[PDB]
Design an enzyme around this catalytic site. Structure first.
Site, PDB file in Angstrom:
ATOM      1  N   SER A 130       1.086  -1.662   0.272  1.00  9.31           N
ATOM      2  CA  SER A 130       0.104   0.219   0.382  1.00  9.31           C
ATOM      3  C   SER A 130       0.800   1.165  -0.374  1.00  9.31           C
ATOM      4  O   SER A 130       2.077   1.511  -1.024  1.00  9.31           O
ATOM      5  CB  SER A 130      -1.389   0.014   0.712  1.00  9.31           C
ATOM      6  N   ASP A 176      -9.654  -4.209  -3.922  1.00  9.30           N
ATOM      7  CA  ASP A 176      -9.496  -3.495  -3.444  1.00  9.30           C
ATOM      8  C   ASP A 176      -9.660  -2.270  -3.617  1.00  9.30           C
ATOM      9  O   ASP A 176     -10.318  -1.627  -4.692  1.00  9.30           O
ATOM     10  CB  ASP A 176      -7.601  -2.891  -3.542  1.00  9.30           C
ATOM     11  N   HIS A 208      -7.876  -5.450  -0.646  1.00  4.75           N
ATOM     12  CA  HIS A 208      -7.004  -4.636  -0.502  1.00  4.75           C
ATOM     13  C   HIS A 208      -5.642  -5.331   1.381  1.00  4.75           C
ATOM     14  O   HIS A 208      -4.493  -5.395   0.602  1.00  4.75           O
ATOM     15  CB  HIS A 208      -6.818  -3.115   0.207  1.00  4.75           C
TER      16      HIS A 208
HETATM   17 CL   LIG Z   1      -1.190   2.074   3.202  1.00  5.65          CL
HETATM   18 CL   LIG Z   2     -10.490  -3.676  -0.573  1.00  2.28          CL
END
Ligand SMILES: [Cl-]
Ligand SMILES: [Cl-]
Ligand SMILES: [Cl-]
Ligand SMILES: [Mg+2]
Ligand SMILES: [Mg+2]
EC number: 3.1.1.74
Length: 264
Positions: A130, A176, A208
């Site tokens: 991320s 995500d 995610h």
């Molecule tokens: Cl993040």
């Molecule tokens: Cl998600």
């Protein structure tokens, strides 16, 4: 022959397993000793040899616990791997880029001699989840001397990575909702030059947080990418070219690449 080859000839099962062929050890990195990052854990092969080295960053509010499985698994295929904590858990992507770089240099210079003697300092890679994947792209743009970069469900406000020349595998997640592939992973992949080694792998049925729990697809393709580009190990080209390129239900929604990949 290629002096950087490690381990046996690969199979699908070997890459999908919970660990590779190398037994591993750990070295804690105290917050106080960690210079320029929050500390972390170094995973390294017990067998005395030199290997490429990899630094992995978590994302916003995350700790090394959310990436530990992946750093340990990659190390068990023949790599020295540090999973970092950041200076604060709220640091932004461009700060995480710095911190990944500081972690590479910690492993090379400031870890125990047991660890430092196992590193080829000329063969380095970075990865991250991320905002840590955004940090991976930023560090790759700063350091074209890296041998590989693997942003995992990456997040960054800059969508244009057109200067990057490090071999880059972006792993996106179809479901995500936090760093959607439509506004993060795919624009990043599309902006990378067509003339570099790059791939886009979109996980099927994945949120995610797929990188934060053991995943056989993330493990398989992270290790194959690191083998191919950190070790120049053409025994791993077969997994990446053509790759899982028509989808694989419940595994891979889409795969894109610039195969064939130039060989250093
Ligand atoms: Cl993040
Ligand atoms: Cl998600
Ligand atoms: Cl090809
Ligand atoms: Mg610690
Ligand atoms: Mg899907």
């Amino acid at each position: 022959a290629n002096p950087y080859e490690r381990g046996p000839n690969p199979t699908d099962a070997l890459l999908e397993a919970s660990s590779g062929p190398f037994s591993v050890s750990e070295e804690n990195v105290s917050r106080l000793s960690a210079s320029g990052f929050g500390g972390g854990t170094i995973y390294y092969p017990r067998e005395n040899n030199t290997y490429g080295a990899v630094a992995i960053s978590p994302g916003y509010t995350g700790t090394e616990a959310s990436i530990a499985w992946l750093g340990e698994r990659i190390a068990s295929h023949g790599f020295v791997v540090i999973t970092i904590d950041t200076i604060t858990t709220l640091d932004q992507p461009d700060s995480r880029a710095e911190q990944l770089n500081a972690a590479l240099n910690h492993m090379i210079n400031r870890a125990s001699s047991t660890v430092r003697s196992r590193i080829d300092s000329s063969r380095l890679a970075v990865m991250g989840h991320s905002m840590g994947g955004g940090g991976t792209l930023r560090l790759a743009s700063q350091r074209p001397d890296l041998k590989a970069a693997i942003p995992l469900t990456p997040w960054h406000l800059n969508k244009n990575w057109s200067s990057v020349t490090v071999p880059t595998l972006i792993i996106g997640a179809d479901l995500d909702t936090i760093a959607p592939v439509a506004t993060h992973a795919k624009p990043f992949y599309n902006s990378l030059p067509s003339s570099i080694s790059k791939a886009y792998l979109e996980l099927d049925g994945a949120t995610h947080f797929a990188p934060n729990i053991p995943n056989k697809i993330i493990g398989k393709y992270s290790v194959a990418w690191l083998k191919r580009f950190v070790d120049n190990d053409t025994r791993y080209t077969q997994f990446l070219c053509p790759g899982p390129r028509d989808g694989l239900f419940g595994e891979v929604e889409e795969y894109r690449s610039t195969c064939p990949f130039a060989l250093e």
